[PDB]
């Protein structure tokens, strides 16, 4: 890159050289189509039923998509026995007792389980009927949950573009990235019937083709959405562009001042130049320029003579007149110039506002590093951007927490595995107990 | 629709004709004002409590409205014999018996154990599952509720948005400020024409690129703002669109171009002139102008398209001395001045060279050309076509599971223990009445 | 306040008086950096997991980030008796031991099933429960991912449809907060403070924000804020109309319409011209221009408001031969210029018609004047109020309900079934006993 600017005394006006050109001649259609991915819905009831977000979603975004469409258009023996009979009378009475007490011991526990089991009941009866209905009600409010972030996720592209196109009532310009992405816009380039180098320059500078393009919405339909991407094109690259800017001249010996009207961009078109009335139609990138034929006004190489003469055969060079002293000053693209006149008091201040300069009632011109501030009589003029604080924003980072419930099986299957200890145990002491009565007759 | 160009080669300019004006003098004011759906927050315990879904969404909302808040300012035979057998036999049971005592036990403690495991199993669910069941369904109901939020309330944050990001002024008039339905009977309030109102209603687009939105006044639970629609105070006049290239001259040293280009559109007796783009736009072949800060002119402008110098009118120009070549494309074709050395070149549609420039000044139009080139420059008559790009989509899935309990299984099995209860509960009754029989 | 407009009658022109000027001169950089709040993923497993949100939204997000980042480049006997009774006794027994096997199978099944109680919730249920208690940990850290980020995305949107450049600085780029301390921090005098800090609308539509630099974490960017170099000078806007009552020195006819509209507003000594609106906006009686493009110009220029025609001031105006009639649209009223053949009228509020015009060029106001027509063209001179619509929004319902178990009641059957075993051991307790005193 190569620019400077030069500045003419005798002019009271300043050029900036070293620019490259690229002009618009044309366009460049393409049509961008997009499937939306659609939810089919799944009807079961979720937590609460007046909730239903899926179908609102759909709506949400269904109307969206109809709005837009409207922008188209007992005996006892005696003697003897004796005794002994009644000592069994007596043994096989505590039997009776002890069985009796046994009997009830057994209806104790029948009762005793007749109750467990009543309540084994209900614990499932919990679980099946109160439990597990609103379990799988949780199960589907997910669902839909997923189901609908899902849909906006991955419908972004075009959720962006239907917005967009809602805020603009269907044109844009910048072609945003969601309406062309870098890979297509690269792409389209490519497809473009241009030369090799014009290619490289678009791509090398994508941001000032997305600022010249536009996005037209084309048709909307619930599950496509398509719209037509305009392009410019270029008709020349590479010519020498410069900018003009001007500031009022006056004499001294008083009495005229002059100040040339065209300023703005001039820049070589087919051996003929080309100038853009206001800033408007040029857009510029280091020292690459893009402007746009429409509106220009093509003129003779000899109006370059204007910026030493004004007056001269050749070019009659538009200017405007006054009878009094005016002073001011006018910001370059590399400096400033100053027009200090009659009584006004002019001054150039550096970096920290120390005053370097100090104007002799005429028409000069400074420069970055030397200047940073000039004023004229009560305005001051910035010829620097003024830098200052930074603001700075902080964020931490955030948590994904979940803590998953389990259960004690092995150690409760021990304790199961032990009640059949039990009952194993049980049965075999009645295999045991029955053998003996079966020995009995 | 006629839409036309004549072009003339007298004063190397081009006109395009048969446009229908519609002119803006005024605005018409409506005030639109929306109520917030407001969240009433519930006070539960998610799954982690340090998330709060609502309480978050309702300050990232109310925030935002803050910000913008700031912007507006038998009895026999030897006997004794039996005795003894029997003594053994009494002897026998009491063993016995006591073996039954001990399975009672056994059993006895088997029950006392899963009954004990019973009680566990139920204060899994009650104390450690169903908390945190319950949980979910809080954090559920929060989710639910802030999706519904933002969809319920979603065209009132649309605008928060775009207020937001212009400083509390628009233009287009989205979708989100006023709905078709909205703009069309407002439409229809308007104190105008029949006619007027029709156009307006079949151009929608256009209305509300020409609209503004000015934001009101915003409170937590309601926004309000201004629409700002235009008002035209004439249609159906004939509109015109001029472009121009520089036209030089022979015998020796002069080059014209007409300096005034753009829309040229009458109105009442005298003809309003519009000199940047900007103020225009168009669709097919209607046009709408902003008279803001047309200039008003006298027919006599007209004699300029064929003349330039002529009594009536003094016409606007500029002025070289020296050859100038360019080409200037129109509506409906293009113009081609070329001068002195420069080469001139007009191709079709594949590129094929149909016409060669004679050193003066021509128009040539859409079919038949395509391009036209001067010296190194080149420039389309029409948008050259390219290249459709697609960009596919799949359906996404509702994959939901329901999980579901042997019910009817589990039943039968305890319906069935009571067998075995009921049925041991018999025997014993059995076992007594032989007992009630020993005395 | 004190806004005026005078007209000039003999110039066909209004001027608007009382404003007061702030006038760009420079420009203030801020460099604004914006951490992103990051998420690290919890690699559970959720119900259903082709389901992925976190994976999912950080994608999306990393992408528009790498989309960003490319912009940039009889009867019986005693002993029969007994024996009888022992024969009884084992039968009873026999029963008792049936009745002991039935209860034993019978709990042997209760217990079979059980398990199957607590396998269902181990294996089957709880799984899924805490599947569910993931996909939630998920959708909380996604939306919880978007509610803190809130600000960064908005940007990054902003920047994406701008491609890294926006006017108006929304209220996203700068808070009013950090406005208001960034103008404290700017070079200028402390009325200047004052001023920008109560018009920040204004001020942020005249400022920019350039997109720095993005990486996946980190945005940054550049604001650029106005500089003044002049207040409170008086500034005036200028609106103009045709003119066909004129002479010059012998020189009869001519209409004239005043070129030069728009913006004058005092710079040091001499006077500062803005050519279009554009360049300036205007909140009451405070007025903001740019610099520029701006023409300087002499006080000289005013008598341009009295005569147009004299010494000290060629005055830019333009020409034509023929009447031409139309009306122009002033900040506080209207100029109307009526000629030759036309009709023009001056109605009010209601339509009654006020005045009707004397072949020549006068000025009216707002209330008396609602409405001029000339011909067949109608001009508001007020904006027409119409129509409020009202949207109404209903509140939103947080719906939950908690589970609950009846624990006590349970509890009760149990330590109640205790009562039984403990009952039945007793039972047992009892008949040992009483057989430890048999032998
Ligand atoms: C969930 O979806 C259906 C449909 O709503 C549920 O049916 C509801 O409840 C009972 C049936 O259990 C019916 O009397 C009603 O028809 C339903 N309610 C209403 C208000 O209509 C059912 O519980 C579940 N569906 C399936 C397929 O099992
Ligand atoms: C209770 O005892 C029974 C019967 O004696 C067991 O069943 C058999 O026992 C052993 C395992 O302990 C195996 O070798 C056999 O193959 C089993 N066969 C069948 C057909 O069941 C029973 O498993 C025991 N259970 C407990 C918990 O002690
Ligand atoms: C177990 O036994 C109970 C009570 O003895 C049964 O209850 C029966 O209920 C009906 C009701 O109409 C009565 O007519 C009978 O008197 C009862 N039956 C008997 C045999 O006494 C109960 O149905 C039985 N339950 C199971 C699960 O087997
Ligand atoms: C069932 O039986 C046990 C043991 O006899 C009871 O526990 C005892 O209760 C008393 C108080 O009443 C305490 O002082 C003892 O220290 C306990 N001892 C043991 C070994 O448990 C038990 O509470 C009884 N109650 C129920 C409701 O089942
Ligand atoms: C769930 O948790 C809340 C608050 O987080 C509970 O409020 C508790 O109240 C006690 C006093 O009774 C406080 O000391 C504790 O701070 C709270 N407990 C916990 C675990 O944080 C309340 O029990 C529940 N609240 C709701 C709304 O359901
Ligand atoms: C949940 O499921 C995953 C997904 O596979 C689990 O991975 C387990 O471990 C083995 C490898 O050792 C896998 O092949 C199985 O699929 C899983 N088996 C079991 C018994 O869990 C993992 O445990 C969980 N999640 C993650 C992120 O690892
Ligand atoms: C650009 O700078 C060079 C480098 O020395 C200088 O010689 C020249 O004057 C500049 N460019 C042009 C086009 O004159």
């Known amino acids: 890159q190569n620019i400077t600017e030069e500045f003419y005394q005798s002019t009271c006006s300043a050029v900036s050289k070293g620019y490259l050109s690229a002009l618009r001649t044309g366009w460049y259609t393409s049509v961008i189509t997009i499937e939306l991915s659609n939810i089919k819905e799944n009807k079961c009831n979720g937590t609460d039923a007046k909730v239903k977000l899926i179908k609102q979603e759909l709506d949400k975004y269904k109307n969206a998509v109809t709005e837009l469409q409207l922008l188209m258009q007992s005996a006892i023996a005696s003697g003897v026995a004796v005794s002994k009979v009644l000592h069994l009378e007596g043994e096989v009475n505590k039997i009776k007792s002890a069985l009796l007490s046994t009997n009830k011991a057994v209806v104790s526990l029948s009762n005793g389980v007749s109750v467990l089991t009543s309540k084994v009941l209900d614990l499932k009866n919990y679980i099946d009927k109160q439990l597990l209905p609103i379990v799988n009600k949780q199960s589907c409010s997910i669902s839909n949950i997923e189901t609908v972030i899902e849909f906006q996720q991955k419908n972004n592209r075009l959720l962006e573009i239907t917005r967009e196109f809602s805020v603009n009532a269907g044109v844009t310009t910048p072609v945003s990235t969601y309406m062309l992405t870098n890979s297509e816009l690269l792409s389209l380039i490519n497809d473009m ?205 955030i948590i994904n927490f979940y803590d998953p419930l389990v259960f004690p099986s092995d150690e409760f299957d021990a304790s199961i595995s032990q009640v059949n200890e039990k009952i194993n145990q049980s049965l075999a002491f009645i295999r045991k107990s029955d053998e003996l009565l079966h020995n009995v007759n």
């Open 193 to 397: 019937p241009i030369t090799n180098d014009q290619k490289k320059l678009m791509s090398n500078n994508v941001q000032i083709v997305r600022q010249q393009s536009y996005s037209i919405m084309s048709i909307i339909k619930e599950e496509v959405l398509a719209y037509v991407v305009q392009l410019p094109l270029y008709g020349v690259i590479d010519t020498p562009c410069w900018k003009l800017h001007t500031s009022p001249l006056c004499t001294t010996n008083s009495n005229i001042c002059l100040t040339r009207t065209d300023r703005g961009w001039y820049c070589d078109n087919a051996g003929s130049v080309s100038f853009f009335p206001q800033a408007e139609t040029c857009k510029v990138q280091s020292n690459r320029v893009f402007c746009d034929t429409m509106n220009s006004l093509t003129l003779p190489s000899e109006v370059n003579l204007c910026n030493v003469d004004i007056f001269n055969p050749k070019y009659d060079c538009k200017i405007m007149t006054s009878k009094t002293d005016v002073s001011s000053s006018v910001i370059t693209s590399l400096g400033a110039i100053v027009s200090c006149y009659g009584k006004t008091k002019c001054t150039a201040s550096n970096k920290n506002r120390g005053i370097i300069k100090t104007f002799s009632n005429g028409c000069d011109y400074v420069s970055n590093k030397g200047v940073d501030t000039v004023s004229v009589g009560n305005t001051l003029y910035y010829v620097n951007k003024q830098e200052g604080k930074s603001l700075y924003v902080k964020g931490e980072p």
